[PDB]
């Protein structure tokens, strides 16, 4: 459960930062991808 | 550490009242808005040219060719609108909760309000549209009302017979330089407040219940900043022009006057008052008093209770004041014709009579009801 | 980044009055403190009378 | 003033998260090029802008090389002309304002770059005006070079009906009915007045999503750090 | 520095080393992400693009 | 600063750790009642000025229209 | 603790993602605008220059 | 008023050493010069246009058509020169009398020095003459030296492939905005100093002999202001072009390069160093160190006496340092040819060896002579 | 366009409409603006005199 | 601030009112001797670096000229 997480990546502040930075690095990829899917589909047939 | 000491005393440990509502967020929002404006203004200044041949062309070049330049420009415009929204709610908080008894803080505030209005006026002149040019001539003309030295003063500011390039360039310089004076005056503002500490919505001495600011009113200010950014970005990214004037997208034609000339949403209350008074000079004065009546406000407090939390009659008078302020904002928009004019005349009479006469008499009556007077 | 002056210098190509860099006709830095040869843009010799330089 | 107020039309670029139909912008650019460019100017729009909107780089150049432009000074110092470039702006239909005034019977065809933004309820107005050249009623009489367009201020626009059904043929073949043409040119003029309409709305979606995540959370962090106090239970126990 | 050439001083650092590395790591990741450094990001399978 | 702000006596003050207490205890459980409690203590002081602003605004609009409307009898 | 901090860590990434985005556009603003970027295809006449000359 | 307290705490009842010489005037002069620059800059901003077609035309319009516009422009230019004269003498006072042991004040100082140099560089780019354009390209090119991200950074600042309008406008914005940051950093500079009080030329603890500032060091600052104004107005009204370059009175020609490219005289010492190092990068670094070596200065103090009043060998080394600083200022002017180059190379070697090596060794020797080491 | 007698507000007339016409009319050389020539030339007043008389 | 700056003892300090004393007592009477006294305690530390700057500056100039002067032997 989160416990395992906490004791590993969320309890030591240094690791807290590490998890944040790494997550953010990937979040952008996911967010942009997911968001684009939503926007483009909403306007599909009108782009380009 | 002599630089960190300030923060510890001011931002990290300052003893703040535990019960201040979300309205006390607004002033911090104003500071954030000021920075935001300054930052966006700096990124408008790297491409804007203050020449009457090229000002509209530079603004269109910002919107069309600079990468995300439309974003920074509409963030600047809607951030000026957000600045005036937060300013009006800050002043309304100060009027409602009796915070004007901090007299030095209140007077530095009304000086800041005058400076912000002048900055926004010259900034709206800056894109050199149709609406900017006719708006500038109008208010610059306001000065001519002065009894003896008026003409000279107007010509001085214009820098010539009529607003023309001479004005635009000096308005760019003044619009650039005044927000830093606003920042210094805000430091004096917070300074005179540090000597006293904030007020609470009950209006009582909150010395028995004060908490730190770092973990309690910082995350609250962060949440308020996030909500204000949500409203600002839904104003910019979804309804960008909803708070603008379509006629400002035409170039400035000194020959023609856009028929529907009107000051921006925030200047309207004043506009109404000016139009209401028949005499030109009278209008100018009343207009000024409109803003200045606030400064006069700490000398009109005749109650033994600081806040309006326990004062229902003055609460009713306060909400009637907010009501006819909204009415004056609407009238300014309406054109000159019956019956908009009469409302304007009454609304101005009611505004000055509620602030000057009705609230101290009501406070005396409220003190009489509690067997205090 | 100054302008080399053509038809001047000790290498019959170029000379930059800013710090004394002498470029040969090839635009190669031969003497001075200039680090690398002048750049040759990717032009196009459409004709012996027409050259589309980038 | 007293003016007909154009109704609200169900456009597509109105959707909170809806982008402009780009085929309609392409058709409206064709409408401007074949009809509106004779008298109106587009000083702040250049061919490069189109690239990535409804045309490709090569196509845009095609468009660019399909017009003539002056080219500063010759080496001789004699101003010369050149094939339009993707960097060239749209050509002036009148070298100077006076020329336009003269040709258009004293009327200055306004630059249609920001017309939609400059006209209250522009998109509608535009459509209405272009499709609102109705006959003047009894009691009103207009001089030459004037037309009773209820929507136009004064109902006396110098421009004559600029769109007769089948005025131009759409390359796409979509029937060129007056309306289909007015709707296309209103979409295009709109695009002109805001080339970033589409890009912005994307950010909008993204912003909402982010706020929809950050706003709720920031609230949980605030309510964590404020729970401590919000559970404080005071009590006065005087010595008694 | 004389005082810093010490036995406990060394012990302290050794104990402090891991944390220090973590911080550099965060920054490095941060820099890669903030700058959208693609030279580095091209290695990451999903981040690619 | 803190320590010299005020003088209180015999006021005990209990509290709990953030992580030990539920984040949103009965948030909608009592929040709704309270918000509603609040609205009924302030609605009579707040709302009727804005109600008569709405009436004056509509009135002005209509009146203005009638003002603009043409009187056929005028021409005769 | 892991529930409360995960929310702090979650929020951070989000803010971090927005903060990089805001700062990125700004930074990008100072980069070359479209007008300049669209510069290419200079045409040169060989006849213009004779041997031993630069232009 | 609480503010009066702050007003007094820093200028009236501040305990100052009774024996500080005229050199201690100079920092106050710098503050006055800052204001003067800001005031003159504001009156240049009401007519200047940051467009490459119109910048030279606007400057000539200021000099020829604005009433006393030539006066304000040449006051601005010679006030920048007076600012750098007072800055160099302020830094020399700090180096000679051991005032760098106030480490926070010294570091805020070297930050202020970097900001002032950047402001003056972009301001000299602003009139868009021949010399401004080639000077800008040169220093902007300096950045390209960066090992990996250099090219990008240069292009960023330029805002395009090469300095052009894109630069001019953003340089106008940055040159406008940085003196207010300089004023805020000067406020931090004054704070970090009052915590410790000013130093005296003997370098001893002056706590036994301190006097007020209002009647003793105020009239002294007023007299220094009057003398500095005399030198500034005899620089403006009698020799308005002895410090500037004539080639800046030509318009900016990208096709025509000048035969000899210089920055303005106060950058020369740095210019010499840059030219001296063969490697481009080396030059840039050394150049930076030239200014930064000062920051490094408080860690090089190895003497038990703070000031150089009782230290003759380090006095000799200090005046040799001032001597080859003047030599480096001269060399920068001289063109690239024998033997100017060798002097430049030596002078730079001697400059870095005197600051880095010779002064702490001399301080150790001086401590050995007094039977202290 | 149209030509009118100069006014006290008119500036001094151009010899050429553009600098490329000056290049064509002066064998490739560009005669510079003489408005600030004295200020733009090192030791201008002297230079001017010397050049014109040298 | 004043009062808490330092601790001295038994140091009496006499003074006179400004208007009671001459403004420039023996200004040139002793000023000159003193200024001269001062210059002779600092001239040997200050002046010889600037003297050799003057020699190096002249030398550089002349050397540069000679450098520029055409080599007669060359081109013949
Ligand atoms: C209604 C249904 C839900 C309900 O019953 O909620 C109860 C709850 C009130 O519960 P309560 O126990 O009676 O009061 C204690 C508060 O919850 C204690 O929290 P609070 O209300 O003091 O929080 C501080 C304040 C902080 O608010 C601000 O900082 C606002 C700043 C000013 C507004 C933005 C500036 C621009 C304004 C332009 C006009 O935040 C709010 O007022 C709500 C923030 C919501 C964030 C987004 C949630 C999704 O209602 C709300 O919080 C109202 C908003 C959410 C609905
Ligand atoms: C040498 C011939 C005269 C002589 O022997 O008189 C003795 C006298 C030396 O007397 P002492 O007993 O050795 O020292 C006490 C001073 O006289 C006590 O006066 P002081 O000289 O220390 O005065 C403070 C000093 C304070 O100086 C400043 O405020 C300097 C401010 C910064 C420099 C100026 C700003 C511009 C810098 C651009 C670089 O003001 C001056 O340096 C002289 C101002 C003269 C104003 C015009 C009078 C006619 O010589 C002078 O006073 C020389 C200065 C006045 C001539
Ligand atoms: C809008 C209505 C806001 C509202 O909720 O009104 C009721 C509220 C009650 O506040 P109170 O009785 O003090 O109790 C609060 C703690 N339970 O009363 C308040 O919210 C008082 C809010 C004070 C600030 C209101 C500002 C409204 C806009 C004013 C604009 C003009 C200000 C003056 C300009 C000159
Ligand atoms: C110039 C010469 C000024 C002068 O008069 O020199 C002698 C003076 C003696 O000072 P002192 O020995 O302390 O005794 C004074 C009280 N009787 O010595 C002094 O005046 C010391 C002055 C200290 C500041 C001198 C600054 C000179 C300019 C330095 C510019 C470069 C600084 C470094 C830049 C990097
Ligand atoms: C292509 C179908 C169009 C569109 C969409 C518009 N026009 Fe024109 N126009 C012309 C002239 C002489 C005027 C000015 C007349 C006057 O001011 O009296 C106009 C004006 C307009 C407007 C502005 C309306 C306003 O309120 O200012 C608009 C939105 C507009 N037009 C749309 C001349 C011409 C042409 C030459 C005969 C033709 C072709 C067009 N216009 C075509 C179009
Ligand atoms: C020092 C910081 C600032 C700078 C450099 C600055 C600069 C500019 C520039 C160049 C413009 C013209 C571009 C445009 O049309 O948007 C502008 C417009 C404007 N500015 Fe500022 N500004 C600053 C701060 C502010 C502040 C604090 C306010 C609010 C009071 C403000 C209000 C405006 C307004 C209302 C406009 C007109 C926007 C429009 O065209 O609709 N500015 N500013
Ligand atoms: C330039 C815009 C302004 C800024 C940036 C600003 C900033 C602030 C800040 C940071 C606070 C402390 C936090 C708070 O209590 O909200 C504050 C409080 C206050 N401000 Fe302002 N302010 C501005 C405008 C004004 C104006 C115009 C007035 C006068 C009407 C004013 C009067 C006050 C008062 C009275 C308080 C005390 C609040 C209380 O204790 O109740 N401010 N301001
Ligand atoms: C906020 C205050 C300031 C403003 C508004 C300002 C504004 C201006 C303007 C508009 C110009 C162009 C007019 C001209 O060519 O002289 C200019 C030039 C200049 N400024 Fe400033 N300035 C300010 C402060 C400063 C400061 C503090 C410095 C010194 C570091 C400075 C140094 C210069 C220089 C060297 C020039 C070039 C003068 C020349 O053409 O030779 N400015 N400034
Ligand atoms: C922006 C220009 C500057 C201003 C306005 C300024 C302002 C001042 C002022 C008002 C003082 C107090 C009066 C005095 O002792 O002269 C002072 C002192 C001082 N400043 Fe600055 N300063 C500036 C630049 C610098 C720089 C660049 C440095 C670092 C090299 C520096 C380091 C110091 C030091 C060390 C003192 C203490 C003087 C002593 O006790 O001996 N200042 N400055
Ligand atoms: C606890 O009491 C305080 C308080 O101590 C402080 C410092 C602030 C100041 C908070 C801010 C972040 C506002 C910023 C104010 C400025 C000085 C604006 C100046 C802007 C700049 C460009 C910097 C408060 O708002 C406040 O009450 C909530
Ligand atoms: C006694 O100790 C002090 C001292 O107390 C103060 C405040 C000053 C500051 C004096 C000045 C007038 C300098 C002004 C400094 C600034 C903050 C510059 C900022 C400029 C503005 C635009 C304002 C001193 O120079 C000084 O030593 C002599």
């Amino acid at each position: 459960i989160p416990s395992r997480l906490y004791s590993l990546l969320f309890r030591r502040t240094s690791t807290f930062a590490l998890t944040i930075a790494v997550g953010a690095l990937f979040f952008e990829r996911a967010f942009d991808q997911g968001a684009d899917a939503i926007y483009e589909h909403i306007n599909e047939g009108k782009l380009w | 550490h002599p630089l960190f000491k300030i923060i510890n005393h001011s931002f990290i440990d300052l003893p703040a009242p535990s019960n201040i509502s979300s309205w006390w967020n607004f002033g911090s929002l104003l500071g954030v808005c000021l920075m935001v404006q300054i930052i966006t203004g700096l990124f408008l200044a790297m491409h804007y040219t203050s020449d009457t041949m090229t000002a509209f062309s530079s603004v269109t070049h910002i919107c069309r060719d600079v990468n995300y330049g439309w974003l920074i420009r509409y963030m600047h415009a809607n951030g000026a609108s957000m600045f005036f929204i937060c300013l009006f709610l800050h002043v309304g908080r100060g009027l409602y909760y009796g915070s004007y008894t901090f007299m030095e803080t209140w007077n530095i505030g009304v000086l800041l309000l005058f400076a912000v209005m002048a900055t926004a006026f010259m900034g709206y002149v800056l894109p050199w549209g149709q609406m900017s040019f006719w708006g500038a001539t109008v208010i610059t003309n306001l000065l001519s009302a002065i009894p003896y030295i008026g003409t000279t003063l107007v010509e001085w500011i214009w820098g010539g017979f009529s607003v023309d390039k001479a004005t635009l360039t000096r308005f760019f310089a003044f619009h650039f330089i005044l927000p830093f004076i606003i920042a210094a005056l805000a430091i004096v503002h917070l300074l005179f407040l540090h000597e006293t500490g904030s007020n609470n919505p009950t209006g009582l001495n909150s010395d028995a219940d004060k908490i730190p600011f770092h973990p309690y009113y910082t995350i609250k200010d962060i949440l308020g900043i996030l909500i204000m950014f949500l409203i600002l970005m839904t104003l910019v990214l979804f309804f960008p022009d909803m708070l603008g004037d379509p006629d400002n997208y035409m170039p400035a034609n000194p020959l023609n006057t856009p028929p529907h000339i009107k000051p921006e949403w925030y200047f309207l209350f004043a506009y109404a008052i000016l139009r209401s008074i028949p005499n030109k000079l009278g209008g100018v004065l009343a207009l000024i008093l409109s803003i200045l009546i606030l400064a006069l406000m700490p000398f009109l407090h005749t109650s033994k209770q600081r806040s309006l939390m326990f004062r229902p009659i003055t609460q009713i008078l306060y909400w009637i004041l907010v009501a006819n302020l909204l009415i004056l904002t609407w009238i300014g928009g309406q054109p000159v014709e019956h019956p908009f004019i009469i409302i304007g005349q009454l609304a101005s009479i009611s505004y000055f009579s509620i602030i000057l006469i009705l609230m101290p008499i009501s406070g005396i009556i409220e003190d009489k009801m509690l067997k205090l007077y | 980044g100054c302008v080399p002056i053509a038809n001047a210098g000790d290498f019959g190509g170029y000379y930059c009055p800013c710090h004394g860099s002498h470029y040969d006709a090839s635009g190669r830095i031969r003497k001075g403190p200039a680090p690398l040869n002048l750049e040759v843009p990717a032009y196009e010799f459409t004709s012996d009378d027409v050259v589309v330089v980038g | 003033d007293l003016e007909l107020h154009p109704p609200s039309y169900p456009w597509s670029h109105r959707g909170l998260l809806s982008s402009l139909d780009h085929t309609s912008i392409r058709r409206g650019f064709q409408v401007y090029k074949q009809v509106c460019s004779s008298c109106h100017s587009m000083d702040y729009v250049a061919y490069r802008h189109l690239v990535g909107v409804c045309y490709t780089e090569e196509e845009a150049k095609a468009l660019a090389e399909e017009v003539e432009v002056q080219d500063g000074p010759n080496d001789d110092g004699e101003m010369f002309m050149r094939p339009g470039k993707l960097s060239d702006y749209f050509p002036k239909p009148y070298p100077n304002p006076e020329a336009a005034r003269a040709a258009n019977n004293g009327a200055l065809p306004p630059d249609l770059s920001y017309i939609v933004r400059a006209r209250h309820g522009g998109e509608d107005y535009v459509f209405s005006l272009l499709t609102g050249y109705c006959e003047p009623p009894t009691g009103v009489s207009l001089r030459e070079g004037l037309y009773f367009n209820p929507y136009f201020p004064g109902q006396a626009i110098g421009m004559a009906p600029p769109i007769y059904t089948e005025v131009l043929e759409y390359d796409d073949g979509t029937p060129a009915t007056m309306s289909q043409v007015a709707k296309d040119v209103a979409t295009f003029l709109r695009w002109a007045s805001e080339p970033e309409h589409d890009h912005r709305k994307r950010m909008g979606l993204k912003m909402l999503l982010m706020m929809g995540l950050l706003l709720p959370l920031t609230y949980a962090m605030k309510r964590h750090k404020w729970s401590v106090l919000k559970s404080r239970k005071l009590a006065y126990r005087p010595p008694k | 520095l004389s005082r810093f050439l010490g036995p406990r001083y060394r012990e302290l650092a050794r104990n402090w080393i891991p944390t220090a590395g973590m911080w550099g790591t965060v920054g490095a990741v941060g820099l890669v992400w903030a700058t959208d450094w693609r030279l580095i990001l091209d290695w990451v399978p999903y981040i690619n693009g | 600063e803190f320590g010299n702000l005020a003088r209180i006596r015999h006021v005990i003050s209990y509290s709990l750790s953030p992580f030990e207490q539920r984040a949103f205890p009965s948030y909608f459980s009592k929040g709704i009642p309270n918000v509603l409690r609040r609205t009924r203590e302030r609605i009579l002081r707040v709302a009727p000025p804005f109600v008569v602003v709405y009436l004056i605004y509509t009135w002005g609009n209509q009146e203005f229209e009638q003002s603009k409307r043409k009187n056929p009898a005028m021409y005769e | 603790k892991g529930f409360s901090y995960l929310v702090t860590a979650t929020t951070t990434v989000g803010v971090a993602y927005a903060a990089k985005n805001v700062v990125s556009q700004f930074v990008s603003s100072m980069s070359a605008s479209a007008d300049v970027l669209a510069m290419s295809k200079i045409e040169i006449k060989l006849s213009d220059i004779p041997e031993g000359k630069n232009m």
Side-chain angles (χ1 to χ4, degrees), chain B residues 18 56-57 60 63-65 68 70-71 74 209 211 215-217 219-220 222-223 226-227 229-230 233-234 236-241 245-247 249-250 260, chain D residues 16-17 44-45 48-49 89 113-114 117-120 192-196 199-200 203-205 207-208 211 214-215 218-219 221-222 225-226 228-229 232 234:
Chain B
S18 63
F56 200 86
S57 300
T60 56
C63 292
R64 292 167 178 270
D65 295 291
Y68 319 101
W70 53 272
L71 181 68
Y74 285 116
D209 218 335
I211 64 186
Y216 292 96
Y217 287 110
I219 197 59
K220 208 160 167 182
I222 278 166
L223 186 61
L226 185 63
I227 296 173
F229 280 166
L230 160 75
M233 300 319 310
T234 198
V236 165
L237 301 171
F238 282 126
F239 315 91
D241 305 355
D245 189 333
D247 291 331
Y249 285 108
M250 292 184 291
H260 200 68
Chain D
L16 191 64
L17 292 171
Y44 311 109
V45 188
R48 35 178 188 76
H49 298 95
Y89 285 85
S113 295
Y114 287 81
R117 275 185 177 268
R119 290 300 175 275
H120 299 68
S193 300
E194 190 176 12
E196 66 281 1
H199 178 43
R200 171 173 53 92
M203 292 183 172
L205 163 65
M207 177 267 300
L208 300 177
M211 294 296 183
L214 296 183
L215 177 63
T218 308
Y219 192 39
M221 290 180 48
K222 189 265 181 184
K225 292 274 184 183
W226 268 86
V228 175
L229 290 184
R232 186 179 55 182
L234 301 180

Side-chain angles (χ1 to χ4, degrees), chain A residues 12-15 17-18 21-22 24-31 33-34, chain E residues 18-19 22-23 25-26 29-30 32-33 36 41 44-49:
Chain A
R12 177 190 294 252
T13 307
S14 76
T15 65
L18 185 62
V22 177
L25 188 147
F26 290 101
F27 168 82
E28 185 164 0
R29 178 64 179 88
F31 181 88
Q33 175 178 353
Chain E
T19 307
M22 219 80 57
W23 286 118
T25 307
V26 181
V29 173
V32 172
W33 181 65
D36 193 9
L41 286 180
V44 184
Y46 184 41
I47 290 308
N48 287 351

Side-chain angles (χ1 to χ4, degrees), chain B residues 37-314:
Chain B
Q37 280 303 99
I38 286 173
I39 286 165
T40 48
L42 189 56
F43 282 82
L44 269 298
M46 318 196 193
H47 313 89
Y48 176 72
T49 313
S50 64
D51 196 353
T52 44
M53 292 302 191
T54 74
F56 200 86
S57 300
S58 64
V59 163
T60 56
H61 168 264
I62 284 153
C63 292
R64 292 167 178 270
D65 295 291
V66 184
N67 317 318
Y68 319 101
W70 53 272
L71 181 68
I72 312 181
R73 170 159 182 263
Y74 285 116
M75 272 173 64
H76 195 73
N78 297 126
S81 276
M82 185 64 72
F83 202 107
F84 271 90
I85 285 159
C86 296
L87 203 48
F88 284 148
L89 294 163
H90 193 68
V91 170
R93 181 177 65 83
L95 285 180
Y96 186 86
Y97 288 113
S99 300
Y100 45 83
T101 73
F102 298 151
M103 293 177 70
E104 293 83 3
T105 309
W106 193 259
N107 295 335
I108 295 303
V110 305
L111 211 62
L112 278 149
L113 167 70
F114 269 114
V116 161
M117 293 177 71
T119 310
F121 169 71
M122 290 180 311
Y124 192 67
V125 177
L126 268 192
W128 202 247
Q130 184 67 41
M131 195 70 231
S132 293
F133 168 76
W134 279 116
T137 309
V138 167
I139 303 301
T140 303
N141 291 173
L142 197 79
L143 307 145
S144 70
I146 294 179
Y148 179 83
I149 62 177
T151 298
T152 301
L153 179 62
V154 168
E155 302 210 9
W156 174 71
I157 302 189
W158 269 347
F161 312 122
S162 72
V163 62
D164 182 65
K165 197 198 315 303
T167 307
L168 178 61
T169 310
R170 78 183 55 184
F171 274 13
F172 181 50
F174 286 142
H175 180 66
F176 206 101
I177 191 167
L178 294 175
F180 307 109
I181 314 177
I182 289 164
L185 272 183
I187 290 158
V188 180
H189 188 65
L190 270 298
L191 173 57
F192 273 101
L193 186 58
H194 289 329
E195 72 156 335
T196 181
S198 303
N199 192 4
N200 62 91
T202 76
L204 305 187
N205 189 20
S206 62
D207 279 342
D209 218 335
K210 286 183 181 293
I211 64 186
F213 184 97
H214 167 52
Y216 292 96
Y217 287 110
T218 292
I219 197 59
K220 208 160 167 182
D221 280 14
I222 278 166
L223 186 61
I225 278 156
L226 185 63
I227 296 173
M228 183 278 288
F229 280 166
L230 160 75
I231 305 172
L232 176 61
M233 300 319 310
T234 198
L235 216 50
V236 165
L237 301 171
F238 282 126
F239 315 91
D241 305 355
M242 75 170 305
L243 295 198
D245 189 333
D247 291 331
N248 209 8
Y249 285 108
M250 292 184 291
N253 175 17
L255 282 56
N256 178 27
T257 302
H260 200 68
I261 285 185
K262 53 170 43 175
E264 202 154 349
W265 71 265
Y266 33 85
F267 294 138
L268 291 185
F269 69 95
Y271 187 33
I273 300 180
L274 170 66
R275 300 162 46 183
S276 69
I277 286 73
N279 174 17
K280 181 212 313 297
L281 251 179
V284 180
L285 273 296
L287 172 170
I288 304 297
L289 272 49
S290 176
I291 298 301
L292 283 180
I293 184 55
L294 304 175
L296 209 75
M297 187 66 204
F299 309 105
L300 308 155
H301 182 76
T302 61
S303 183
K304 294 181 176 67
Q305 302 174 303
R306 185 180 183 177
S307 166
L308 292 188
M309 194 181 264
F310 317 122
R311 293 176 60 194
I313 313 170
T314 310

Side-chain angles (χ1 to χ4, degrees), chain B residues 92 95-98 100 297 300-322 354-355 357-370, chain F residues 42 44-46 49:
Chain B
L95 285 180
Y96 186 86
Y97 288 113
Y100 45 83
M297 187 66 204
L300 308 155
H301 182 76
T302 61
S303 183
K304 294 181 176 67
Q305 302 174 303
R306 185 180 183 177
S307 166
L308 292 188
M309 194 181 264
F310 317 122
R311 293 176 60 194
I313 313 170
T314 310
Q315 272 176 33
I316 293 169
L317 288 188
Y318 178 84
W319 290 119
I320 290 163
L321 176 68
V322 176
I354 290 166
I355 303 183
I357 307 165
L358 279 185
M359 293 180 183
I361 286 173
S362 75
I364 287 168
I365 288 174
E366 292 178 353
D367 288 324
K368 187 268 183 181
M369 294 299 291
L370 286 171
Chain F
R42 286 302 183 255
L44 292 178
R45 294 104 176 275
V46 169

